[PDB]
Amino acid sequence: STGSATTTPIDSLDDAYITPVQIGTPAQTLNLDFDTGSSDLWVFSSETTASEVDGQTIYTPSKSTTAKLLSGATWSISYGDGSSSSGDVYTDTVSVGGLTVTGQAVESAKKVSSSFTEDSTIDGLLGLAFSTLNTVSPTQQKTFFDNAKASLDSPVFTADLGYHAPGTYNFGFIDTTAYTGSITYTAVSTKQGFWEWTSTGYAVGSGTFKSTSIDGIADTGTTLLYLPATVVSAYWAQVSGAKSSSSVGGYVFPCSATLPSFTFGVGSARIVIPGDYIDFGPISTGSSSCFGGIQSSAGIGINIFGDVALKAAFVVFNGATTPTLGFASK
Incomplete structure (x- = not known):
């Protein structure tokens, strides 16, 4: 079926x-x-x-x-x-x-x-x-x-x-018509009950790719992308006027900005999140301060590949005896 x-x-x-x-x-x-x-x-x-x-x-x-x-x-x-x-x-x-x-x-x-x-x-x-x-x-x-x-x-x-x-x-x-290129599969740990995997690194905009292991979960029920503070700081440092606001609860940026893309690694493959996907709009109606779609995981205890990341890909949740995750561009 x-x-x-x-x-x-x-x-x-x-x-x-x-x-x-x-x-x-x-x-x-x-x-x-x-x-x-x-x-x-x-x-x-x-x-x-x-x-x-x-x-x-x-x-x-x-x-x-x-x-x-x-x-x-x-x-x-x-x-x-x-x-x-x-x-x-x-x-x-x-x-x-x-x-x-x-x-x-x-x-x-x-x-x-x-x-x-x-x-x-x-x-x-x-x-x-x-x-x-x-x-x-x-x-x-x-x-x-x-x-x-x-x-x-x-x-x-x-x-x-x-x-x-x-x-x-x-x-x-x-559905082989729903994605471009090939699907890259990556190992999953079920030890915490999640679709937990390890990304191979990241890039900000047109910058060079940083090879580094980032353990996190594929979570369709979380809106944003939550990553280590080092990674998130490197991203927002490329946006003029962006800052972390304790009163708002995360990184905010001028609504007049054009945001850079963010790339994450899946094995040797790369998924590109366009900058527009990272714009979550004014913090309150009519404000010129906008809420960022990439935020620090430091207060969570786990990195979370939420909708911001997943909607840039076609994602396979493989529930075979040894589960794996697959990502393709689309």
Whole structure:
């Protein structure tokens, strides 16, 4: 089997991407944030505290003839941005782009933090990291990809995120028309539950490539590119007037600037992020200070290849017995 679904930016900055997902019988379609940095499929629901729902579409298990309470199971998750959610668990039929999993754990939110309430465009998350990170207790549950894997033509999914435009998540096949050149594959460590890999270095603009190993994660659920402070300083030093602002929370730059590109290494191959992809616009409406798309990881504990980096590539998440990641230009 295979599946193919379009993913669409939630706003004009590509802050996140939503993909329609069918849950239950008859189908209830919710727009979920596919997140290769976490491993829970959770949704706004008929059980979510009413004051914490503000425009989202909700899953109502009592209207699904295939829903069943997973008795005794609870979940609770906290994300790197400080947001969180928790609740109980149903199993139900879940389909993405024509690919159907029966018995998928659908985590129903009883509580969500303010950032989720305040984002009316995201109805939940669909985690695509390794199932060892799933938070359901006392019986840990499998991700959608883990459940579908055996039925897939090939044990892979691909992320093809657009710059200010829709893109595609495919399951079970590699669309050879969606990229240019060849795909370069690189080793993955699953020891922390993430799609963790080592980039071979970087370049700023037209500058020379610096060979240096940068361990980090491929995370579709993080907006920006978070790298070591040395790398990020070298980037922003090429932008007149750019500076790190403690009050704003990162590097800012004059909105009048033209930003240089940023290149990262995948083995001997190179992925170029155009300068425009690094512009996240005014820090507040009408400001002439703009927020940068490359930020320091120093306060995180891990480097994160988020959407800024991934949307410059066609990315293969290879879930074979020994997982690997593939990157191609497009």
